[PDB]
Amino acid sequence: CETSPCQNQGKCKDEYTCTCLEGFEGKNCELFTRKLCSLDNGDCDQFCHEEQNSVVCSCARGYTLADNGKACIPTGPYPCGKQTLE
């Protein structure tokens, strides 16, 4: 940890370990978790849009937006756009 291998003020242990501040990930906290729609769809399951420079996710017909604000929860066995399993 002598060189401060952990970026963005993450905390270095010890062959070493990074415990990142919120908002950062990667092994060395070098990757932003906040992102816009252009990258990994904003981490949204379905629809992504930007409000106030911030990502907001939403869901299509037959889904509800999960409390985590990203996942889409089906409202029944036949939600839209899924091939039928049974």
């Binding site: 992504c48 299509a60 017909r61 066995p77 036949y78 756009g81 899924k82 091939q83 039928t84 399993l85």
Partner: protein, 238 residues
């Protein structure tokens, strides 16, 4: 569909088939909900009377779970232009609701801006139907699907003997022998995103089927998402 593969059990559950007074399929449609089917406006002029079949994978064999629905209301886009097929879009409201089951489920309608940035930028979408399996051949009695690459708008316009309006897009192959074909008109073009299928086109027209230097032309669903929403928010007779 020329080339591609037969849809497997559950694989293309949003497919609908418009059947004429003789009970012959003549156009496809896409299931949007329990009551609404999306199709091409030009199809409406190609049978005097028609009904909508869902859940069919093999047309020469009743097989339970197939169902035929009457049409209560036809909603053609008023700006459908017969000479150019501009605005080639219609919605059908059914007399009685579809009950979703194996092989019968709706495709998702996407939000417009998202669809433009995240579906229309993908490499490919999937087209399906019961149309001819060869330009000079006959309608499939089996539902087929085909992966078709999106073709950029400039290339599309340059390929075409006919105007490509902003309400249309090209998908398919320059010379590979794979395409949609007569009888597929009105059916689904969908684009996958993270395991979910969203409506991105309606099979519209083509110069022959899978001809070298020609692409399939699809109604561009993004241009009509608002129109589809209005047509659907309607919800039954007053």
């Amino acid at each position: 569909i020329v080339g591609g593969q037969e849809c497997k059990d559950g694989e293309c559950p949003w497919q609908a088939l418009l059947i004429n007074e003789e009970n012959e399929g003549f156009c496809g449609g896409t299931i949007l909900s329990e009551f609404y089917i999306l199709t091409a406006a030009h199809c409406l002029y190609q049978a005097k009377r028609f009904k909508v079949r869902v859940g069919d994978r093999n047309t020469e064999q009743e097989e339970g779970g197939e169902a035929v629905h009457e049409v209560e209301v036809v909603i053609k886009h008023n700006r459908f232009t017969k000479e150019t097929y501009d605005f080639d879009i219609a919605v059908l409201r059914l007399k009685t609701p579809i009950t979703f089951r194996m092989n019968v489920a709706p495709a998702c309608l996407p939000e417009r801006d998202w669809a433009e940035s995240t579906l229309m930028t993908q490499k490919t979408g999937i087209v399906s139907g019961f149309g001819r399996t060869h330009e000079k051949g006959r309608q499939s009695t089996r539902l087929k699907m085909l992966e078709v690459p999106y073709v950029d708008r400039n290339s599309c316009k340059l390929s075409s003997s006919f105007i490509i309006t902003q309400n249309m897009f090209c998908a398919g192959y320059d010379t590979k022998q794979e395409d949609a074909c007569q009888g597929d008109s009105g059916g689904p073009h969908v684009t996958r995103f993270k395991d979910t299928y969203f409506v991105t086109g309606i099979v519209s027209w083509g110069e022959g089927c899978a001809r070298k230097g020609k692409y399939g032309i699809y109604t561009k669903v993004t241009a009509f998402l608002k129109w589809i929403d209005r047509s659907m928010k309607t919800r039954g007779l007053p």
